[PDB]
């Protein structure tokens, strides 16, 4: 079989509302080995245990950030500031494991096939925002130079509880949303 190891870097800024972002990550096929938290200058392995088997020098990421942020200003110039059509995210929402009532589980929400790589996820239960235990991923490179981002909500399935995931993409005046609810048959 064939495998791919990716060093993916992105450096971006928006001017309408002024904001800027940067990312450095290593990806094995479609999964993330690690990302460097560029402000803390800290390597964060997607699974803690990966850290015991290998290490990465975060200084290497920041040296690349110096050139990234320069190349970005050059190509803004070289392109007469040309713009790309945004691409609104699709949304997947599903549990990690088949649901048994009172058995702890995780709801997984991913935003897929979106560009630019700026998107925030909001979890609601029964209409009310929930943030406890949530993990938000970095932006994972997807075919056609698009991105995917994952959010995880730990939850205990109970009768009567409706859950929602909403994504706000940079461009849009509107969220993309999905609902999920346990299906419990009758004996």
């Amino acid at each position: 079989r064939r495998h791919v190891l990716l060093q993916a870097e992105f450096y971006q800024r928006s001017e309408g509302p002024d904001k800027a972002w940067a990312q450095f990550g290593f990806h094995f096929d479609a999964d993330e080995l690690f990302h460097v938290e560029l402000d803390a200058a800290q390597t964060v392995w997607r699974l803690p245990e990966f850290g015991r088997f290998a290490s990465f020098e975060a200084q290497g990421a920041l040296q690349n950030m110096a050139v990234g942020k320069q190349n970005l200003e050059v190509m803004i110039s070289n392109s007469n500031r040309s713009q790309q059509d945004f691409v609104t995210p699709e949304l997947a929402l599903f549990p990690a494991e088949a649901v048994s009532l009172e058995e702890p589980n995780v709801l997984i929400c991913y935003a897929d096939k979106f560009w630019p790589p700026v998107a925030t996820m909001e979890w609601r239960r029964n209409g009310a925002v929930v943030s406890e235990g949530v993990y938000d991923s970095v932006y994972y490179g997807r075919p056609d130079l698009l991105f995917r981002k994952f959010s995880y909500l730990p939850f205990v399935p109970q009768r009567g509880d409706v859950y929602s995931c909403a994504v706000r993409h940079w461009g849009a005046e509107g969220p993309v949303q999905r609902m999920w609810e346990p299906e419990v048959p009758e004996p």
Partner: protein, 204 residues
């Protein structure tokens, strides 16, 4: 631990509302592991790759007109082209040896559960669901057997879904109203498994 090696940003782009995006993607493609290794450096502005470097070609190739000025300049510097070619051993070969144990040879077994789903129009089970969860690698085979016979026509399967935590899942539904004295078996084949998992469904 052992040190993962990063491709340095040796090349610099040369000058020649709004959102503005620049991307660098250094791809270490492995075929038969270390037997054949290809390094692709992709340079992207917005969603258009303006140029790339192929280890096999050994030179930068412009994918768009905007990439033509950059490719010519980078190709002028022979030391850069040599340094980029050295990344096939420096990054791709080096990193493969450190990460193969917990990546290329990751094995996590599927967990397999069958449950009955109710019709929603009638007081009966209309579907049997085989939840296959928590597995790596992503490639898997899940098959329904009714009284020893493989069913294809009445089975609807989801895509294999990335959980994002290095595990994958798939749901294979058999459309049937279960009958007492009938055998319903979900059979799962995966690289992690010496013997396939045959998960039978029994009523109450």
């Amino acid at each position: 631990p052992a040190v993962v090696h990063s491709v340095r940003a040796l090349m610099l782009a040369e000058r020649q509302g709004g959102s503005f995006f620049y991307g660098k993607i250094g791809e270490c493609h492995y075929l038969n592991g270390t037997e054949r290794v290809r390094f692709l450096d992709r340079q992207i502005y917005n969603r258009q790759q303006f140029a790339h470097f192929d280890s096999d070609v050994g030179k930068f190739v412009a994918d768009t007109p905007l990439g033509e000025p950059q490719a010519e300049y980078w190709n002028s510097n022979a030391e850069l082209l040599e340094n980029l070619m050295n990344e096939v051993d420096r990054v791709c070969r080096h990193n493969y040896g450190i990460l193969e144990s917990f990546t290329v040879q990751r094995s996590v077994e599927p967990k397999v559960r069958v449950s009955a789903l109710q019709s929603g129009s009638l007081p009966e089970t209309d579907r049997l669901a085989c939840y296959v969860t928590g597995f790596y690698p992503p490639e898997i085979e899940v098959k329904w057997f009714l009284n020893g016979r493989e069913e294809t026509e009445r089975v609807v399967s989801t895509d294999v879904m990335q959980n994002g935590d290095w595990t994958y899942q798939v749901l294979v539904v058999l459309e049937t109203v279960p009958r007492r004295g009938d055998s319903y078996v979900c059979r799962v084949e995966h690289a992690s498994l010496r013997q396939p998992i045959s998960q039978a469904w029994e009523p109450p």
